[PDB]
Amino acid sequence: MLKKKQLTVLDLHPGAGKTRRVLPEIVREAIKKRLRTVILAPTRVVAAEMEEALRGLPVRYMTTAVNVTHSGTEIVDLMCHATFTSRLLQPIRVPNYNLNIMDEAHFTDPSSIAARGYISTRVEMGEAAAIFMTATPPGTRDAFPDSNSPIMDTEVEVPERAWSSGFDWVTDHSGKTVWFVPSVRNGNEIAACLTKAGKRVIQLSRKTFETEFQKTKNQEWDFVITTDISEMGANFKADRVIDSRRCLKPVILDGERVILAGPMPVTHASAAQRRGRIGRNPNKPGDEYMYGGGCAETDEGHAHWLEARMLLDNIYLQDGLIASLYRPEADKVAAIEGEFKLRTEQRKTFVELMKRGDLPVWLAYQVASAGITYTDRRWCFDGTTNNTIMEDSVPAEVWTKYGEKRVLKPRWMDARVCSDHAALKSFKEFAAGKR
């Protein structure tokens, strides 16, 4: 696997031991061969699990998620997928790693797709090796892969709203359930219903994931209500998954605005990863997978692959060359390669809007490419009337950094800045000049 120009898809089924058994063997071999190696974890939670899998191997944990004292001599680095792409974009030295290992390599956040594009391009140039670890490579059509123990698969109507009757099977269960919902707001409504029925519920989403995931270890629970973030190596002591089989798809309309379309069907890869939360213990056969819809290839025209092109157009590779998306997922976007390349100062603005600004990639790009500087928030208030953002059925208002109360009405409207209360609070802080 470790030879130059080799990209290996380590596609063992979910729970087959890719992270805990195979990865430490790869790392031992890499160190013996003096290969400068990077290991990419999708989340801080997985970074900390990897330290346990790799204990007593000389690895530099480029994350505050791991409490370790480095020797200073490590030739293996571990960081998050997002950290890798972030450091490529910034004026910071990133080693040309001989071996590039991506764990949970199916992750479809923009920074993960961009990282696969960069790594697979360096391999194709003949510079590097890569290992992509996932049960569900891009374009997999199998929602029901093999497991450590037999799963009971049942197609059934799954509630997506509060219910009073007609779903007794949901609450009659005495075990632990992981329930995948299409959005934070949908999970809130289902969580409230379950809580009202006397169940202990933990809610997970991207922003809350590290803090709330610890509650799955520290407290007794009946249900975990999660968005698709739990597709990325989240492990639970569960015996049932309830899967809406639904997700939100960010869609760019008319090059002008981003909407959160759907909910609509998940991909096969997503469904297999959701199911893959259970069936993991060979001594516990008959974990249950209840699924409420079919799969479709909803990644086609999904904004994350356009956003991945915005990131890759702004990463130095060699002279004016630009990394291609990883071939199996390259048809998910219609972009002109290089169309999003920014000059040095606009790139710096673009990076700062994503990092400190915490804006979606697409929205950061519209602002930076318009020649607006990071702290200039005039654009948050000068959009068209249909761009008015709502809070409790009235226009959302902030006090500007000038001390003027203004309606939130961004010149470029991205539905992800107000898809839930937390997002809207963050965007209101931004529009007010508070970060």
Ligand SMILES: CCOc1ccccc1N1CCNCC1
């Ligand atoms: C932004 C944090 O990234 C780093 C970058 C390089 C090496 C180590 C670290 N940290 C991680 C946090 N503190 C421990 C070591």
